[PDB]
Design a protein around this nucleic acid. Structure first.
Ligand SMILES: Nc1ccn([C@H]2C[C@H](O)[C@@H](COP(=O)(O)NP(=O)(O)OP(=O)(O)O)O2)c(=O)n1
Ligand SMILES: [Mg+2]
Ligand SMILES: [Mg+2]
Length: 347
DNA sequence: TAGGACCC
DNA sequence: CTGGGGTCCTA
């Protein structure tokens, strides 16, 4: 027997949800983000269709930047309520195949299938793709392996509308010549540090001395970076419901603020909007954090713990404004944010 | 508590 | 020019 980890990720998620109700746009570049107005600044692309992506438009790109690259593109406002309902339709369907399923964000899910050696995991992936296609109209891609991070990397090669199997038989074959940030968990900043140390590929990272990576990244991050290069990762798929450790709300304003009454007002409204939402889900606040971005993108965040776990609205607003006054507040502010950290439950 | 570094 | 919402680790 072999314990396979299957990673399901939805193709161009937000675009496909819109394309499902707009057959007029089937072949045209569709861009989701910020009220559907490409003139608006400080708004970014949250999804670009595969057609729009061939123009170089990707997630996080400003709307006006995307308008420059693809003028022919239909811009749609983001509709989170529609994406949530499409997400639960997909996921409430992925649990009813009788497998351990670890939901991971709206777009992705890890599925555990302990199959006999004579049985092919591709047959499970082939089923997943078309029960999702036949009952939601959305297309997915499945990555197959024996750990989450490698199944995740396998999904990248399966896109679009495909399946890709990645194992130790072909791991270093496929990934050896790739840069470090091709692994899940390592990004641009670590890849830059490794390049300055002579490590430029996954293969070179996999045979790097541990007491060279640990004394450069941390005692456990160093060894974890070494596992990842070897194709290892997390192997337990847990169907337990995830409990959020915190919830937050941030806003970038159209023009940078200057008056503090507006800053005291934004922090208070953000704090009360977040508090009302955690009360609804039955949570209790432990600490209050406030974030300031400034025009030069200098963002730091301060946090204060409450005397006791509370959800009192007067106390949390007072605490948020008290953390805000702890801030220097010289330059114009670009973004203010409130994050309420939640007591790690009970029932 | 602060802050860097991922990721969707 | 550089959104919004999360989490884990390290100093
Ligand atoms: N930086 C990002 C990345 C994704 N998202 C949202 C929008 C995505 O449609 C959705 C799915 O995340 P994603 O799989 O990484 N990208 P997306 O599914 O849109 O395109 P592909 O998976 O086909 O490459 O999360 C976001 O809001 N900001
Ligand atoms: Mg996706
Ligand atoms: Mg995804």
């Amino acid at each position: 027997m072999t314990k396979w980890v299957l990673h399901v990720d939805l193709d161009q998620f937000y675009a496909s949800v819109e394309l499902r109700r707009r057959p007029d746009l089937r072949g045209q570049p569709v861009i989701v983000g910020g009220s559907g107005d490409p003139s608006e600044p400080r708004k970014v692309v949250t999804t670009a269709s595969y057609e729009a992506r061939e123009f170089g438009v990707h997630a996080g790109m400003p709307l006006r930047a995307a308008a420059r690259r693809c003028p022919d593109a239909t811009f749609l406002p983001s509709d989170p309520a529609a994406y949530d309902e499409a997400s639960e339709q997909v996921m409430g369907l992925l649990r009813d195949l009788g497998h351990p399923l670890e939901v991971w964000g709206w777009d992705e899910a890890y599925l555990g299938a302990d199959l006999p050696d004579e049985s092919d995991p591709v047959e499970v992936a082939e089923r997943i793709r078309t029960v999702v296609a036949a009952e939601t109209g959305l297309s997915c891609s499945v990555g197959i392996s024996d750990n989450k991070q490698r199944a995740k990397v396998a999904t990248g090669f399966a896109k679009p509308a495909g399946i890709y199997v990645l194992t130790e038989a072909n791991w270093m074959t496929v990934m050896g010549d790739r840069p470090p940030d091709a692994l899940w968990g390592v990004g641009p900043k670590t890849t830059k540090k490794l390049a300055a140390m002579g490590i430029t590929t996954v293969a070179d990272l996999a045979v790097t001395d541990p007491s060279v990576l640990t004394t450069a990244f941390g005692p456990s991050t160093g060894l974890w970076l070494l596992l990842l290069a070897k194709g290892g990762g997390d192997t337990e798929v847990s169907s337990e419901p995830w409990v959020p450790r915190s919830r937050s709300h941030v806003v970038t304003f159209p023009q940078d603020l200057t008056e503090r009454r507006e800053m005291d007002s934004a922090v208070r409204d953000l704090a009360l909007q977040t508090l009302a939402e955690i009360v609804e889900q039955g949570r209790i606040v432990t600490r209050v954090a406030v974030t300031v971005r400034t025009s030069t993108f200098y963002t730091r965040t301060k946090i204060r713990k409450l005397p006791a776990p509370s959800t009192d609205a007067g106390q949390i607003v007072d605490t948020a404004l008290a953390v805000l006054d702890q801030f220097e507040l010289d330059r114009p502010v670009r973004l203010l944010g409130v994050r309420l950290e939640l007591a790690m439950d009970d029932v």
